[PDB]
């Protein structure tokens, strides 16, 4: 069926771990979904 083969990327001086798992996915049925949202200190202190 010519299934797309994505090569996994390892953390890099400018490409840290959490960045990778958040911005990159190796399962290409999950491409082009939508945008995801997160929070850091103040927006998290409000939300939570």
């Amino acid at each position: 069926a010519k299934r797309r083969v994505i090569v996994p990327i390892h953390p890099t001086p400018n490409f840290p771990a959490h960045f990778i798992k958040s911005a990159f996915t190796t399962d290409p049925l999950k491409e082009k979904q939508k945008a995801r949202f997160s929070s850091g200190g103040e927006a998290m202190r409000e939300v939570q």
Partner: protein
């Protein structure tokens, strides 16, 4: 032969002072501007947005190197 016995005077006075900085005092480093980061958009396969602090952003950076990243009010 030996006519005498004496106490060995010396002038040890340092009065001139020469220091010369080693070459690595003037070598280069990477310095950066540092602002509080208000938010971040990362996109490579899937776009993910973090928001730390919600304010009108006065400044925005864009960086393409591997993953596209937009650092907001960086």
């Amino acid at each position: 032969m030996f006519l005498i016995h004496f106490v060995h005077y010396k002038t040890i006075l340092q009065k001139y002072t020469f220091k010369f900085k080693h070459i690595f005092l003037s070598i280069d480093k990477y310095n950066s501007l540092f602002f509080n980061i208000s938010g971040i958009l990362i996109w490579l396969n899937i776009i993910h947005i973090n928001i730390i602090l919600i304010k009108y952003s006065f400044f925005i950076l864009i960086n393409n190197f591997e993953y596209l990243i937009i650092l907001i009010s960086t």
